[PDB]
């Protein structure tokens, strides 16, 4: 037989990721402009001993071009992983979320939101498995793990947001070139 | 003392910083573990204008941190650290248009449909950028703008326009999940048929 | 006794009459002052099917009266007089599509935008035909159609769709200032993202 | 200097004609299905001594193709005339209109609606005067004049409608090819 349209699995994955991201983004924004002035931002960033995140060991691309030469499987392997990496860590952010003012910010609500999207991607990997040789290094790599507070937290918030954008961006690069007319005219 | 004014990325592919009025600027980006940061000077003080430095695609990367600073004789007038991804601010949509959607019989009222295109540099055809737009309109002789919720497509209707007056319309874009909104588009003046 | 069933003009350029089940038909059109009416038989009993006669562009004229009748042995089973212009009934619009217009946060509700194209035979690009369209939709497990006022463009939003259900959409055209409405388009099934 | 956009004169002429037509059409429809069955329709039509209208002496085209090779001026000369022809005759229909059930049906309301659109076209002739040699026969011809009741009336109604469609159709053929993007995509 041929193959069933994936435009429902994508619309359902792409909503979920877009949500995780919209959550990540707003909580960061909130935290940052209460306990982190430009002062602490640059210091933090200037010190990879704070600006560097655990999820930077699973090699992602860094610009349209390099990313637009990544086989579908590949892109979906990377996003599967970033999602898994944040599976435990989110545990922490918990209060921050359930202490924020975003309708939907909560440790649980997010964990489930991550376990949900996680299953969604594997499924597309099985189906939307677009040629791409399932034999490579990123394919052989498991996810990533995590080890004052104010900083520590804003550090995680920095990376959650950084990463959720990666995930949400890699999916759409798959969506557009797999479900025609979806990023239409 | 020249201080930074703005850094913006129109399509997440290249960026440029500008400042107020020799001032030179230096940059460094986290090339992996620690910074290579052999502080390099601006690679283009021309492409983008006066008091500007242009970073094309090859000096551009997303999700990798950047630090910048414009030095002077025995100086450092402004230090700046950011990351390209959080500095996007797409160009204004363009090619605005409108046409009657529903001829309102008696007159008085009328419904139209405004349309436009995404600015040309944003790769929305292949996924690099998703864009939300926002449109606003008002009768030409009033200063307050009627604001409309942000739609996700390049067309939408604006209902109940009183036919006995000229209106104006403008729209602006912003990549999803980023605070930016570039400039508004050129204004679109709306004059209706009226009287029949 | 074979009686006429229908005569329709899809684009005001050609027409065809059909009937129910040798029956032949004759025609005559007012070629100016009085009728030339040398009653000519159908010029095409094939192009349009069984029990049909096809009048292409060269046997077609607008605003000029036509008379028709399908004879039999010692017969005349149905006489018909009309005028092409008042017999238009354009084809169904086609290439239907939809996309989220506004992601409704919690779920429950959602807004979309349906789009389609004018059927291919209608010269709307140069003025021969102006078309109004009508769209209708309903949840797949209900028989009553939600009717929407006729819009003048090839796209429009349908708001408040409950996300927890599958809907269907169909549209149909009709040249302005003529009673016709051809058949509805192929149905468009709408399934939303839901849950997030 | 160059030239000012005509997209407002056209939107204003094209609304007016579309109205006259929508008026003409509906009153006909109404009259016809009260006092004229298929019986009388075919008889009437079969007899040009009833089916023929005065406004058929000013030579109009009769199919897309022939009409799409008519110079702008030309098309606008013909429509100017059909509008003028119906200037007096409408006098009659008066009751019919002010006896109908169409919000807008009335002798006066229509006369003015005809005098209005009439001025509108001449103006476009002056402006939208698109090359076209103002020297020809239709250009040298004035309009047309008019001489039981039930029939007489339905005869006029037949022609008003027939003609208002001609007018409204010839304008748009001018609109589209003169104001770009107006019959868009």
Swiss-Prot record, chains A, D:
GO MF term set: cytokine activity; growth factor activity; growth hormone activity; growth hormone receptor binding; hormone activity; metal ion binding; prolactin receptor binding
Entry keywords, A to Z: Disease variant, Disulfide bond, Dwarfism, Hormone, Metal-binding, Pharmaceutical, Phosphoprotein, Secreted, Signal, Zinc
Organism encoding this protein: Homo sapiens (Human)
Keyword Disulfide bond: yes
Complex formation: Monomer, dimer, trimer, tetramer and pentamer, disulfide-linked or non-covalently associated, in homomeric and heteromeric combinations. Can also form a complex either with GHBP or with the alpha2-macroglobulin complex.
SUPFAM superfamilies for the chain: 4-helical cytokines
Gene Ontology CC terms, in alphabetical order: endosome lumen; extracellular region; extracellular space; growth hormone receptor complex
Location of Phosphoserine modifications: 106
Result for mutant: residue 173 to M: In short stature; idiopathic autosomal
Lineage top rank: taxon: Eukaryota
Subcellular location: Secreted
InterPro entries: 4_helix_cytokine-like_core, Somatotropin, Somatotropin/Prolactin, Somatotropin_CS
Record-stated family: Belongs to the somatotropin/prolactin family.
Identification of the protein by name: Somatotropin
Anything else known: Circulating GH shows a great heterogeneity due to alternative splicing, differential post-translational modifications of monomeric forms, oligomerization, optional binding to 2 different GH-binding proteins, and potentially proteolytic processing.
UniProt-reported outcome of changing residue 27 to I: In IGHD1B; reduced ability to activate the JAK/STAT pathway
Gene: GH1
Disease: Growth hormone deficiency, isolated, 1A: An autosomal recessive, severe deficiency of growth hormone leading to dwarfism. Patients often develop antibodies to administered growth hormone.
UniProtKB/Swiss-Prot annotation, chains B, C:
Extracellular face residues: 1-196
Glycosylated position list: 56, 97, 102, 141
Disulfide bridges in this chain: 7-17, 42-53, 67-81
Mutagenesis or variant effect for residue 170 to H: Found in a patient with idiopathic short stature; uncertain significance
Motif (WSXWS motif): 181-185
Effect of residue 183 to D: Found in a patient with idiopathic short stature; uncertain significance
Annotated ranges, domain Fibronectin type-III: 92-195
Subcellular localization(s) per the UniProt record: Secreted
Task performed by this protein: The soluble form (GHBP) acts as a reservoir of growth hormone in plasma and may be a modulator/inhibitor of GH signaling.
Record protein name field: Growth hormone-binding protein
Organism this protein belongs to: Homo sapiens (Human)
